[PDB]
Amino acid sequence: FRKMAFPSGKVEGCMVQVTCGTTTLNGLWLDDVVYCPRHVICTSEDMLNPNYEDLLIRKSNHNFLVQAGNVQLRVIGHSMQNCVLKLKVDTANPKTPKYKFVRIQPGQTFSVLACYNGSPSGVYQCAMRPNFTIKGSFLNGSCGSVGFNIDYDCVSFCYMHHMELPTGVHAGTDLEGNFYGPFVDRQTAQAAGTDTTITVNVLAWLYAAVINGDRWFLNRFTTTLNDFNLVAMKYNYEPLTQDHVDILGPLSAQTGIAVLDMCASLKELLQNGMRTILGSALLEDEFTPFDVVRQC
Amino acid sequence: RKMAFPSGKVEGCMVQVTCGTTTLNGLWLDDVVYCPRHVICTSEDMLNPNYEDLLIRKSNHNFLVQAGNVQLRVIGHSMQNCVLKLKVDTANPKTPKYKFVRIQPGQTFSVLACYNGSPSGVYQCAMRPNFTIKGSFLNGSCGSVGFNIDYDCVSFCYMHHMELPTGVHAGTDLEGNFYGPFVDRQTAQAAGTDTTITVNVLAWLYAAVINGDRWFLNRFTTTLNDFNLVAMKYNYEPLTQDHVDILGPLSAQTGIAVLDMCASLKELLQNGMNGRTILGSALLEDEFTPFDVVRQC
């Protein structure tokens, strides 16, 4: 049962390169605006303690170079919204998909188009971890790469990539430049807090295992939310809420395994351990309930 | 992380093909649509299809090709092995630079899973040694294609034909020749024993080292023959001298000789992981090639 990203085509045609002095990274071109990390206005020197207000006031249109493929776009306007730089350009993107900017919640999944020098290099499927980091595969030069979900023909942009934290995980904002998690866009000592496991996604993935005929961990027992939560907290698993239960309801119906029955399965796996489920030795938590229905 | 190639160049080629009551996906390149030839069958015909007999009874107007909203007009058709080629009157304007390649077991590629000619998702997989792929495919996915994109050229290597009893997948190159000994007929055919792709596992261990993971290394070396005698008792594929040569550059970059990495693998197979992890995995990963690792590292 595979991690599956959305087809990236609608986003590929919006990626550009943005250079400011000696700093280059990626930008998103929608209509006549290009969106990118505001830190592109900084030298490495500046990043120690940047004053973005001042750094921007001292800049103007001619300090920015935007390349769409080989064609240079001329910048005719610059502004900052939170941690995102918005450059107005002379040409509107004729490949602009229908889109919107949404902010996602921890535990939600999305696709990422890793790019280098404005060139798309690959796509993969992630989740917003409970500690507001993402376990992505960004290399140097990936800053400004976006994350998205597609619904019919409408792209929902939810992530812009800003940085790697010391532990190898990533940190970013929404497209309005609001960070996910307690991070700042300056070269200072920052760390992700203790991560937890996304309980409702694990349960979703057990449903997928049963659907695929992997049934060994089912048992005759059931649980309570409180007894389960006591176990959940013991193992660094997110609290399971009624909202969660309700959301799994469609998979509860389609397999005959109610959530507190499935919770009793998960309870036992936490304690005793496992052998394999869907070809995995670890309990997987980056598929949502919605994701399991889409793919199953 | 297993990354797929950006799918947009292929998305622009996907269409819906219908013949009578049967509908699957096709691939619109220039003025041709490629698709599985069993589009011309009913479920009844699938036990013992005579494709030559079924095809000669068809005319151009029997094939409904649909490109999003637009009906393409079929003006010719021929069969090449297990692929049907439908000549249409419009060249696909979104045709990318492309070629058709046939791949070998161990090679990776991206799949664009499509339904009714509509792309729904993209994933990365590999040709298993038993010539199946472990894909993610529902009913209606036939005609979905696998590809690599090496510098702006799309190399098509797979077209999806069928699911086998174990839930693995069988299909052709874009000249319509099947990977492995499978046939496009409902028969008792089954995937042989799946083995692990040793040379890929080694590649991924070299990746772990380059990302600063060394805990699984040991002080030992091995001969090639002793390595293979041992690995095959865990259903690992044999490592050939070619594999060893192929790993040469990763050997040089890290400073760890191939046979030392081999010794390390033997130890991992004996010990398991003792509750720890390698590039985030509690299993040994075999779906990254030497090329994929060099490319992304």
Ligand SMILES: Cc1cncc(-n2c(=O)nc(N3Cc4ccccc4C3)n(Cc3cc(F)c(F)c(F)c3)c2=O)c1
């Ligand atoms: C392996 C990896 C994975 N994801 C992201 C990065 N990453 C990167 O590619 N480039 C950065 N740069 C360039 C530059 C040019 C001029 C001035 C400053 C910088 C920093 N950074 C570091 C970075 C990003 C921030 F947003 C930030 F606030 C900070 F302090 C450092 C990468 O992390 C690296």
Ligand SMILES: Cc1cncc(-n2c(=O)nc(N3Cc4ccccc4C3)n(Cc3cc(F)c(F)c(F)c3)c2=O)c1
């Ligand atoms: C879960 C899954 C994953 N990948 C592929 C399939 N798959 C499918 O979607 N449809 C098939 N059909 C419809 C039809 C309409 C008219 C005539 C015949 C068929 C069979 N088949 C079965 C199949 C495909 C072959 F190529 C083949 F040679 C065979 F005998 C059976 C699917 O496997 C299923």
